[PDB]
Every structure is written in structure tokens, then in C-alpha cells.
Design a protein around this motif. Structure first.
Motif, PDB file in Angstrom:
ATOM      1  N   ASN A  37     -14.956  -7.009  -6.000  1.00 58.99           N
ATOM      2  CA  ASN A  37     -15.207  -8.309  -6.633  1.00 58.99           C
ATOM      3  C   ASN A  37     -13.696  -8.883  -6.500  1.00 58.99           C
ATOM      4  O   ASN A  37     -12.752  -9.190  -7.482  1.00 58.99           O
ATOM      5  CB  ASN A  37     -16.375  -7.875  -6.939  1.00 58.99           C
ATOM      6  CG  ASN A  37     -16.902  -9.293  -6.866  1.00 58.99           C
ATOM      7  OD1 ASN A  37     -16.573 -10.055  -5.780  1.00 58.99           O
ATOM      8  ND2 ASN A  37     -18.211  -9.041  -7.256  1.00 58.99           N
ATOM      9  N   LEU A  39     -13.996 -12.679  -8.186  1.00 60.93           N
ATOM     10  CA  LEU A  39     -14.906 -14.075  -9.203  1.00 60.93           C
ATOM     11  C   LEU A  39     -14.063 -15.088  -9.257  1.00 60.93           C
ATOM     12  O   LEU A  39     -12.631 -14.199  -9.658  1.00 60.93           O
ATOM     13  CB  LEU A  39     -14.945 -12.807 -10.971  1.00 60.93           C
ATOM     14  CG  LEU A  39     -15.394 -11.595 -10.186  1.00 60.93           C
ATOM     15  CD1 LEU A  39     -16.002 -10.674 -11.081  1.00 60.93           C
ATOM     16  CD2 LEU A  39     -17.243 -11.930  -9.175  1.00 60.93           C
ATOM     17  N   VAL A  51     -12.387  -7.689  -9.322  1.00 62.02           N
ATOM     18  CA  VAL A  51     -12.288  -6.022  -9.780  1.00 62.02           C
ATOM     19  C   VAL A  51     -12.123  -5.041  -8.847  1.00 62.02           C
ATOM     20  O   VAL A  51     -12.234  -5.127  -7.685  1.00 62.02           O
ATOM     21  CB  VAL A  51     -14.914  -5.748  -9.867  1.00 62.02           C
ATOM     22  CG1 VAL A  51     -14.996  -4.766 -10.227  1.00 62.02           C
ATOM     23  CG2 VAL A  51     -14.652  -7.345 -10.848  1.00 62.02           C
ATOM     24  N   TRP A  53     -11.902  -0.458  -8.040  1.00 61.44           N
ATOM     25  CA  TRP A  53     -11.387   0.972  -8.460  1.00 61.44           C
ATOM     26  C   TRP A  53     -10.119   1.159  -8.487  1.00 61.44           C
ATOM     27  O   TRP A  53      -9.542   0.792  -6.939  1.00 61.44           O
ATOM     28  CB  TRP A  53     -12.846   1.562  -8.173  1.00 61.44           C
ATOM     29  CG  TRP A  53     -13.606   0.713  -7.999  1.00 61.44           C
ATOM     30  CD1 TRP A  53     -14.484   0.536  -9.125  1.00 61.44           C
ATOM     31  CD2 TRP A  53     -14.706   1.656  -7.121  1.00 61.44           C
ATOM     32  NE1 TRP A  53     -16.092   0.531  -8.715  1.00 61.44           N
ATOM     33  CE2 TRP A  53     -16.309   1.295  -7.462  1.00 61.44           C
ATOM     34  CE3 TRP A  53     -15.759   2.859  -5.862  1.00 61.44           C
ATOM     35  CZ2 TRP A  53     -17.864   1.272  -7.292  1.00 61.44           C
ATOM     36  CZ3 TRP A  53     -16.402   2.909  -4.947  1.00 61.44           C
ATOM     37  CH2 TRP A  53     -17.798   2.049  -5.954  1.00 61.44           C
ATOM     38  N   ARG A 118     -11.970  -4.872 -14.395  1.00 57.65           N
ATOM     39  CA  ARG A 118     -11.752  -6.146 -14.525  1.00 57.65           C
ATOM     40  C   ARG A 118     -10.958  -6.346 -15.230  1.00 57.65           C
ATOM     41  O   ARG A 118     -10.659  -6.904 -15.884  1.00 57.65           O
ATOM     42  CB  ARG A 118     -12.708  -7.379 -14.423  1.00 57.65           C
ATOM     43  CG  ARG A 118     -13.018  -7.992 -14.635  1.00 57.65           C
ATOM     44  CD  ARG A 118     -14.686  -8.909 -14.623  1.00 57.65           C
ATOM     45  NE  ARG A 118     -14.228 -10.151 -14.843  1.00 57.65           N
ATOM     46  CZ  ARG A 118     -15.340 -11.372 -14.943  1.00 57.65           C
ATOM     47  NH1 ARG A 118     -16.988 -11.240 -14.862  1.00 57.65           N
ATOM     48  NH2 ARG A 118     -15.099 -12.762 -14.802  1.00 57.65           N
ATOM     49  N   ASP A 158     -11.601   2.779   3.057  1.00 63.22           N
ATOM     50  CA  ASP A 158     -12.045   2.046   1.525  1.00 63.22           C
ATOM     51  C   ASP A 158     -11.660   1.022   0.420  1.00 63.22           C
ATOM     52  O   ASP A 158     -12.419   0.663  -0.036  1.00 63.22           O
ATOM     53  CB  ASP A 158     -12.058   3.908   0.829  1.00 63.22           C
ATOM     54  CG  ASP A 158     -11.373   5.021   0.461  1.00 63.22           C
ATOM     55  OD1 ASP A 158     -10.400   3.797   0.432  1.00 63.22           O
ATOM     56  OD2 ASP A 158     -10.941   5.506   0.255  1.00 63.22           O
ATOM     57  N   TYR A 162     -15.862  -1.533   0.388  1.00 58.12           N
ATOM     58  CA  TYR A 162     -16.479  -1.105  -0.259  1.00 58.12           C
ATOM     59  C   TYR A 162     -16.693  -2.803  -1.689  1.00 58.12           C
ATOM     60  O   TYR A 162     -17.249  -2.901  -2.595  1.00 58.12           O
ATOM     61  CB  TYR A 162     -16.970  -0.388  -1.615  1.00 58.12           C
ATOM     62  CG  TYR A 162     -17.106   1.760  -1.240  1.00 58.12           C
ATOM     63  CD1 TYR A 162     -18.396   1.999  -0.710  1.00 58.12           C
ATOM     64  CD2 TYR A 162     -15.674   2.214  -0.762  1.00 58.12           C
ATOM     65  CE1 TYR A 162     -18.471   2.872   0.327  1.00 58.12           C
ATOM     66  CE2 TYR A 162     -15.520   3.453   0.091  1.00 58.12           C
ATOM     67  CZ  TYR A 162     -17.533   3.378   0.588  1.00 58.12           C
ATOM     68  OH  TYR A 162     -17.589   4.802   1.162  1.00 58.12           O
ATOM     69  N   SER A 164     -17.989  -6.472  -2.002  1.00 60.86           N
ATOM     70  CA  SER A 164     -19.911  -6.734  -2.643  1.00 60.86           C
ATOM     71  C   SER A 164     -19.273  -8.147  -1.015  1.00 60.86           C
ATOM     72  O   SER A 164     -18.597  -8.934  -1.534  1.00 60.86           O
ATOM     73  CB  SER A 164     -19.515  -7.636  -4.196  1.00 60.86           C
ATOM     74  OG  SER A 164     -20.851  -7.940  -4.039  1.00 60.86           O
ATOM     75  N   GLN A 165     -21.405  -7.927  -1.118  1.00 63.24           N
ATOM     76  CA  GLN A 165     -21.282  -8.460   0.327  1.00 63.24           C
ATOM     77  C   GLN A 165     -21.610 -10.189  -0.355  1.00 63.24           C
ATOM     78  O   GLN A 165     -21.897 -11.253   0.159  1.00 63.24           O
ATOM     79  CB  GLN A 165     -21.686  -8.034   1.445  1.00 63.24           C
ATOM     80  CG  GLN A 165     -24.007  -8.122   0.120  1.00 63.24           C
ATOM     81  CD  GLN A 165     -24.820  -7.349   0.700  1.00 63.24           C
ATOM     82  OE1 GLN A 165     -25.471  -8.372   2.065  1.00 63.24           O
ATOM     83  NE2 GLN A 165     -24.816  -6.271   0.698  1.00 63.24           N
ATOM     84  N   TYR A 166     -21.225 -10.398  -2.120  1.00 62.56           N
ATOM     85  CA  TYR A 166     -22.429 -10.854  -2.374  1.00 62.56           C
ATOM     86  C   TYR A 166     -21.293 -12.085  -3.418  1.00 62.56           C
ATOM     87  O   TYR A 166     -21.475 -12.918  -3.862  1.00 62.56           O
ATOM     88  CB  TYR A 166     -23.284 -11.146  -3.599  1.00 62.56           C
ATOM     89  CG  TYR A 166     -24.847 -10.108  -2.807  1.00 62.56           C
ATOM     90  CD1 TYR A 166     -25.213 -10.793  -2.149  1.00 62.56           C
ATOM     91  CD2 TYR A 166     -24.857  -8.456  -3.551  1.00 62.56           C
ATOM     92  CE1 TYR A 166     -26.527  -9.224  -1.400  1.00 62.56           C
ATOM     93  CE2 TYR A 166     -25.938  -7.865  -2.393  1.00 62.56           C
ATOM     94  CZ  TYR A 166     -26.962  -8.784  -1.506  1.00 62.56           C
ATOM     95  OH  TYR A 166     -27.631  -7.954  -0.866  1.00 62.56           O
ATOM     96  N   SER A 167     -20.099 -11.758  -2.903  1.00 60.19           N
ATOM     97  CA  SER A 167     -18.840 -12.639  -3.754  1.00 60.19           C
ATOM     98  C   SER A 167     -19.021 -13.468  -2.640  1.00 60.19           C
ATOM     99  O   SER A 167     -19.215 -13.310  -1.229  1.00 60.19           O
ATOM    100  CB  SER A 167     -17.639 -12.057  -3.331  1.00 60.19           C
ATOM    101  OG  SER A 167     -16.563 -12.586  -3.789  1.00 60.19           O
ATOM    102  N   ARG A 168     -18.322 -15.117  -3.058  1.00 55.45           N
ATOM    103  CA  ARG A 168     -17.587 -16.085  -2.318  1.00 55.45           C
ATOM    104  C   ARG A 168     -16.453 -15.353  -1.565  1.00 55.45           C
ATOM    105  O   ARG A 168     -16.025 -16.784  -0.994  1.00 55.45           O
ATOM    106  CB  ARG A 168     -17.057 -17.133  -3.330  1.00 55.45           C
ATOM    107  CG  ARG A 168     -18.963 -17.465  -4.243  1.00 55.45           C
ATOM    108  CD  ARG A 168     -18.090 -18.881  -5.672  1.00 55.45           C
ATOM    109  NE  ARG A 168     -18.042 -19.936  -4.682  1.00 55.45           N
ATOM    110  CZ  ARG A 168     -17.595 -20.929  -5.286  1.00 55.45           C
ATOM    111  NH1 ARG A 168     -16.763 -20.818  -6.536  1.00 55.45           N
ATOM    112  NH2 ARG A 168     -17.604 -22.418  -5.078  1.00 55.45           N
TER     113      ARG A 168
END
Ligand SMILES: FC(F)(F)c1ccnc(N2CCNCC2)c1
Ligand SMILES: *[C@@H]1O[C@H](CO)[C@@H](O)[C@H](O)[C@H]1NC(C)=O
Lengths: 202, 201, 205, 205, 202
Positions: A37, A39, A51, A53, A118, A158, A162, A164-168
Motif C-alpha cells: 500500500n 497511504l 506498507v 513486506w 508501515r 511479486d 499483491y 492493494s486495489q483500494y489504494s488511491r
């Protein structure tokens, strides 16, 4: 051996303060960031909140066991292991570790530690709202071990798969290079991995 | 000796609570700030948020080992070492240490501890948006050891490590030695005074 | 004795959980706040964010050593010492300790602990932007020890109330006064001592 | 016995993990909230930020000593004691403990633990800016011990529930009531006892 | 046995680092989230702040005792127990545990751990102010144990525990089992996907 025996042996003979160098060769540490992500981006201050890994691998032969009627792998608290002293040079916050602090140890002494982190960075946010996007460079290496003690190498979709499809934001590209730097003060070389994250507002 | 032996010996014997004074002379601590970033400036409240590397060096002979067929240096957790009790007198937040809390110990007993710190200060922010810029003074010294126990000295490019992505730029850094006596206490406390002359780009 | 011996003896015989009462007399604790900064004032909510040095002194005879050919004083982690359980009754945040958590111990067993603390208080902020300024009262006493176990007194003051105060604060100090109080609560039949510190301050220019 | 002996005995034997049940009867825990401040109210989100003293009392006979040439009471770190696992069921933040984490233990084994807590709650904030004010209910009981293991009751006296309230709050207290409840969920057959504290408060003129 | 004996035995023989696998079969972990509150929703950033009780159950036979003239259950600090290393894959903050960190252990070795957690997630907030509402998916599984070591399975009124004072209301909660395999490695990681269908009240 069962899991209980292996974990007892590791806890009892754990030298977490001792870098596991073999025959005065560096410990080869692999570092690969998988971005999850983006943010809070600020194009005024050039600060991003990410964010990721942090996939970290190295060998510690003092952990090895005979796997022949035994587990191939166990989960170990990192407090019972030596871990490389990696720092992101351009971080402006402490790493916030979101996940349980366990590594996987393979019977041959390979360690895989992959915390979800994060963290806030000082990097180039210019162009984030354009088609070609921003390129934020994150530099990670040993804080105290030079190149004869720790070597850091990128490993290689990779890194972005992975996210997030929901990030701006969306990821256009991720590239990794190794750097080896000698400063005027000090005769030793310090290695880092430079990760270039090319991203934009969706 | 191997690394494992040296680190075992240091962990077993280092006495982290004991200032390593030689023959009742002060421990000579060197302090030099490398500025990395200036993040939040407020000219109304006179507060700045700064990121610096606090290069700290001193000798602790109780750590020394014979380096013949042995490492010249090891990395040691600071929890296993005496470290000087340095505080920034004009800090208005706890030091946020961004880096692993390990020092380098050389076989002769020299210790080098260089944490990256983010911290907020009360200092003069006036003129930050002018050509000659603001001058923010940061004072760092021992919280509890006076000049007969700890002496602090500055070490002998001001922006070589400074982020090119900061909204601010560094015009000049000077680091000088001071000695302070308070009404409370008859002894003098040494500090390094770091003058950060910076402005909005 | 050298520093190493004194610090070994203190660490090995340290009873940090044990109040060092002498012959069932209270431990006499001195408390004086030296104001360093006033950072955030809100006249609507009556809340202030303050930075102060909390000068705390008491005697613990179990720490004493013979100072002949020995140091007069050592620096000791407070984790190895009994420390008084002082709380500010009108604090609305945990004390943020800015400084290393070391006290000075003198060879006679006197302890001096002076942490730099940032903390938020509920107090009277009215008049902060007037000539006579606001008066914010901070009350500090033992959380669990009554007057027969801990007594609190102001320290001696031989300086300017603003000798350590930041010249860069938006605020200035007009006056600091300290009085002793002894209070009986509904809960408890015993009296609890506190020091009340009146900080008279105002917005500059 | 001196304080050092009593505190050594409690540290060595207290069993902090063991609920001090007598003859398979529940441990009787008393809870009373003394309100100190109301800091942030949001009528839109139905959230309040409160500061309270959580007066908690129970008996643990394993702590008892013969007081005949000995202190009647000592201050003990709560890490050396069993403490009830109280939670506020409608809290939306961790309890911020503002005070030193010490309880008072009486020679008969009575414990008094009274931390000052700042915590945020989800409750009814409607009517806060009216004459009759809002009524915010806070529910406190054992997180893991049902009614056969812990019973929670309000104290017999609540005379002082607003006696310590800050005169500098934007809010004022009209009334506090503290009453005993039970929660059962449909899934699970055991009842958990709680104290329901009804805080009737409003914004000041 | 009394409570003191059972708790002494558990504290003395506690291997909190050792997964209690029986005959190399996975530990079956049940997870169900009971939503208590929705505190902050941001439809621009797709972020939610939630309070939930994380009902977690598993068997650890090494804890079991004979319950004849003994308690059926005790409260145990989780520091004395193995607990599954569960993480929410789409969390963007550390879990803030609001409650005392005690589990219930039944005499047969069943453990129930139900912390109250406040945590922030990256998930789909679109439609929160409409009649059909938003659907926020939270994924929870083992951070380090694959399907041969830990299996996660979902277990009444979706709003029996939900605050009547929230700005939001729950339309529906569904919990379904998922499996992820990464390209490096043949092992599958199980998660429970919790779909929270909620909206702003009138
Ligand atoms: F790099 C990834 F993300 F593909 C990867 C590779 C190997 N293992 C991973 N995980 C992440 C979730 N917990 C453990 C398995 C993740
Ligand atoms: C260090 O060790 C080497 C080799 O064992 C020896 O020759 C030398 O004398 C030692 N020096 C000291 C001062 O101990």
C-alpha cells in the motif's frame, strides 16, 4: 527430532548478538520489498507513507539440524535469532511492524524473515499526479556491518502483484540496484539495496 | 579470539552502569551532528522537527582485546555497554531513534555509536523564509555527569548527507564547546552547541 | 571504594520496592518544578502542554558509603533505586520523560532525581492574553503514601523563575510560587501531602 | 515484620496469575468511578474522552500478615499481585494509566487499587448541549471470569463520585449512578457481572 | 486439583514458542470477528477504523487436566500459552488490544482467546452512504504457518454486539475460507475473509 526439540535447541544455543560469518566471508543477506500500500503522499513535503513486506533471507549454519525424520522448517521468534541490522537511510519514522515477529528457519540454516512494515520516507513525490508518475527511491543496508561482514543483494512480479486495489495510487514499475559506498571518514565499504518505486495517483 | 568469544566477554564483563573513568580524569566524549532532514518548521511557535546522525565516540579500556588473529571491530547492542547519558537541553520531544541500537567497538576499546535521531526542538525559527535564513541552536551534553566526569568536544560538507528532497536547505553548521553552571549545582556541565543556519528553498 | 564497587553494591542490595523510612518517621521528599517551556495553551479547554525539570530529593541511608578515598557521588539508573510515587493530580497525559533515567546518589545517601518532563494539565488558562496573565496550579504528591510515610516540601529556590525558560516560547513567566497542602479524602482516614505550584504566565507582545 | 520482609514475602508467594477464590465462592470485587475530567465530547460520533479514578477493592487472604509489631498497610507494585481483569465493554481506546501502578495492601489481605485512567468510550452523547444534558453509560466487569468466579458490585458509598471533578472542564456533572448488571450473550451460557456507571453531564453555560 | 495447581503446571510446562501439532496434522484454528463499532470511515482513501472481538479457538492437549473435583476452566495469561500468529493481511495499523491479555483454557485443552481489537484497514468503502452500503473485506490468517501446520476456519445476530451509538449500522457479515499460494513455494496459506456490509445511518 520434533518441533519442541528443535525450538529448545535454538533457544538454548541462540547467540542473537553474534553475526554468523563463515570463514571470514560476509553473511549474504537478500532483501526484496513487496509493496502492499501507499497511504498519505505529500508532494509539498516530499514524504510518503508505505506498507511493504520486507522479504529478508540469510544463512545461519549454527541453526541447522538433521531433517531426516524431522520437520524441514520451524517458526522462531526473532528475539531467539541473529537478524541483520538493516535500516532504510531515508526513513523519517521508526518501522511500524504490523505482523507477529517470527522468522522461518529451514533445517539447512536458511532464515526467512518477512515482516509487514508501515514506514514514512523522504523521497521524490514530484509527478505523482501525472501519467509517468513519481519515482520514490528507498535505500536499505546494514547500519553497522561493512561489506566484508554483510553483503546485501536484491532478489527478483511479486514486488507489485499483491498491491492493494483500494489504494488511491497504483504501481507503474519497481527496479532494484545494489550500491557499495566508501565515505571519506572510514576505509570500509557499506552495501545497500536501492528500490525505485514508480507510482501515480489512479 | 572469534566474534562469539569477544561478544561473550563484553556481555559478561562490560558494566553498562559504570562510567569508564581512567585515574579520576573525565571520559572524553566526541559529539558531531550530521543533518539529514528538516521536516516541520513553525515560525509562530519557534519549533523544528530535525533528523540527524549523532556521531558519538569515547574510549572504554574494559572492552579492549588482543586483535592478533582476531577481528579488529565488533557490533555490540548498546544495552551491553556504558553509553554517555547525552540529552539535548532544548528538545521538546523524546529522541525517536530510527536505526538499530548497535555501536562499533574497536579492539583498543574505542566505541563509535551513530544513531539516526528524529527530535523536535524549541529554537529560533525567525528568518527561515529569508535569504540569510534562521539559526536554530541545539545544545547536547551529559544529563548527570559534570566536567570532572564527562567532557564533550565537537570533532575536528555541512549538507553532504542532507536530503535533496527537504523543503529546506542548509547554509552553514557550526559546532562549539560550552560549559554551563546552574544555580542548583556548584559544578560545570559541558555541552556541544550546534548552530544550524537553514532556510526554505 | 571506586565507582564500579559502589554501583555493584547498590545494584546487588537494591530494594526499589521498599520506602526507606527511618524509625517510623516519614521520608522527607523535596519537589520543585523548573519551567523550561509552555508549548500549547488552549483557553477554551483550559489545557496546557508544559516542559519542566522536576527536581526531586530524598534520603535513602541504605545507599550510603564511606567517601574517604572514594567518589562523593555516582549516577544510578532509577530502576536500581526506590523513587517516590509522585503524581500530578491534574495531569491529563502520562509524563513524557525526555532525559536519561539516572539519579545522582551522594555518599551520605541523599538522592537527586531531576527528569525533564513534557505533560498536559487541566488548569486555569483564563487571562493568558492579558497583562496579569493566567495562573495554572499543578498539584504533585504521593499517589499511595500518606503523611506518616511521605512528606512533600518545596525545595530551596535561589534563582530567577525563568533562568531555564526558553526565550523562544510564545509565553513568558511572570511568577512561580509553591505551597505545601495536607488533604483528607472520603476514601481514606489518613492525610496526603502535596506541593501546589502556581505558574503565572502570559502570551508575549 | 518490617516493610522489606512483608514486600519480600508478597513478591515470593503472591501468585499474580491465581484468582484468590475462597471455598469455590466468587471473589467479591467493588468498583466505583470518581470522575476527574471530561475532555473531548463528540455528539455526532457519540464518543467521549473521560479521566476517572477507578477505585477497585477485593480480599486476597494469601497476602495477609500478623500486624502486631508491623505496618498495618504497604504499597505493592500490581505486577506482584493478582488484580481483577476489569475491562470497560464500551471503551474504544486502551486505558491510559496516568498514575504509578501501586496498590495498598492491608495486613488482613484487603487490596485497594485506584489508578487514574484516561479512556475514550462509545456512549449516548445526545442532549450534551441542553439543560437536562447527556447520559453516558460506562459498563465495567471481568473480561474472562463469569459470575461464579468474580462478582462486581458498586461500593456502598458513592458520596464523592464528583467531589474531585475539575472546575476547569468545559462540562459539568448533573448526576452519577453506579448499579450492578449482568451480561449474557445468546451463544454462551455464563453471565458476566458489571457495574453500569451512568454519567449525566452537560456543556457549561 | 485447584486453580493454583493447574496454573502452576501450565506456567512450568508452558512452551509458548511450540505449535501444538498432533501426529503432524495441522492445528485447526477457528476465527470469528464480532463487530462492536465502526469509528472512522474515509471513502476517499478507502480506510476504516473498526473495533471487533476476535473470537479465536484451538486445541492444545499439553494444557489438559483431569477435571474430576477440579475447575472445568481457568484464565491464563497468553504469555504462558502458544497462540496462533494471526495477522490481518490488509491492516494498515498494529492491532490495538483494548482488553486484558488472558485466554480461557478448558480441562480438555480447548483454548478460547477473545481480545477486543481496534485496527485500521485498507478496504472497499465505496457505497457507504447508500442503501446497499459498503462491503469491507478483512483477511485473517497465520503469518508464518502454511496449511499443513495451521488451518483457519470460520465458526447468530451480526449486530448482537454492535454499538447502537455508532454512526454506522451492519447490514450483513459473512466469513469464508481462502487459500493463497506464492510462486516461490508450493505451500498454501489459509485465511478467513470477513465481509462487513455496513452503511451510514439515515
Ligand atoms: F513475496 C510474496 F509476497 F510473494 C511472498 C512470498 C513468500 N511468502 C509470502 N508470504 C506472505 C504471507 N505470510 C507468509 C507467506 C509472500
Ligand atoms: C597478543 O597476542 C600475540 C599472539 O598470541 C602475542 O604475541 C602478543 O604478545 C599479545 N600481546 C599482548 C600485549 O598481550
Amino acid at each position: 527430532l520434533d518441533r519442541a526439540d528443535i525450538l529448545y535447541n535454538i533457544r538454548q544455543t541462540s547467540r542473537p548478538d553474534v553475526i554468523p560469518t563463515q570463514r571470514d566471508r560476509p553473511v549474504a543477506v537478500s532483501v526484496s520489498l513487496k509493496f502492499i500500500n501507499i497511504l498519505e503522499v505529500n508532494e509539498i513535503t516530499n514524504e510518503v507513507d508505505v506498507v511493504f513486506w520486507q522479504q529478508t533471507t540469510w544463512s545461519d549454519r549454527t541453526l541447522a539440524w538433521n531433517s531426516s525424520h524431522s520437520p524441514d522448517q520451524v517458526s522462531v521468534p526473532i528475539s531467539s535469532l541473529w537478524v541483520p541490522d538493516l535500516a532504510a537511510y531515508n526513513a523519517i519514522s521508526k518501522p511500524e511492524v504490523l505482523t507477529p515477529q517470527l522468522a522461518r528457519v529451514v533445517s539447512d540454516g536458511e532464515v526467512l524473515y518477512m515482516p509487514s512494515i508501515r514506514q514514512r520516507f523522504s523521497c521524490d513525490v514530484s509527478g505523482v499526479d501525472t501519467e509517468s508518475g513519481a519515482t520514490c527511491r528507498i535505500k536499505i543496508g546494514s547500519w553497522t556491518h561493512h561489506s566484508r561482514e554483510i553483503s546485501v543483494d536484491p532478489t527478483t512480479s511479486d514486488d507489485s502483484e499483491y498491491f492493494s486495489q483500494y489504494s488511491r495510487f497504483e504501481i507503474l514499475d519497481v527496479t532494484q540496484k545494489k550500491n557499495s559506498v566508501t565515505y571519506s571518514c572510514c576505509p570500509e565499504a557499506y552495501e545497500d539495496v536501492e528500490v525505485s518505486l514508480n507510482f501515480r495517483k489512479k
